[PDB]
Every structure is written in C-alpha cells, then in structure tokens.
Amino acid sequence: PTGTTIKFNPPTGTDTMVTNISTKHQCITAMKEYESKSLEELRLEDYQANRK
C-alpha cells in the first residue's frame, strides 16, 4: 500500500523542557505506518496515484 492512505495521527511522546512535558509529533513519518519512508517519497507515490 503506497502513499498516505492511512489517516494521519500525531504520535504521543514525552520530553523535558528548560519542566516535564508531553508531546505530539506533527510529522506523518513519525507514525509507525510510515516510518521507513521520507516525506518526499510518500508525496511522490501519492502523486503517481493521482492522490492529490
């Protein structure tokens, strides 16, 4: 399954700040479903699927 057919959902995480916070990662390639492809790879195969 190429492209970005799975719905985007920002992964949850935790970090420290300068104090303790929780994070949402607003990048589709942070999801496990996409973490082996880059943004440009994902977009090109969405483009080749006319999925604009």
């Binding site: 970005t4 999925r51 604009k52």
Partner: peptide
C-alpha cells in the same frame, strides 16, 4: 506544503 501530514492536508 511539505506533505508533513500526508495528502489529506494538501490544498492545491
């Protein structure tokens, strides 16, 4: 747009 949220957030 940089595809950072996939195609659903692309407004051509």
């Amino acid at each position: 747009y940089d595809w950072s949220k996939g195609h659903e957030f692309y407004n051509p």
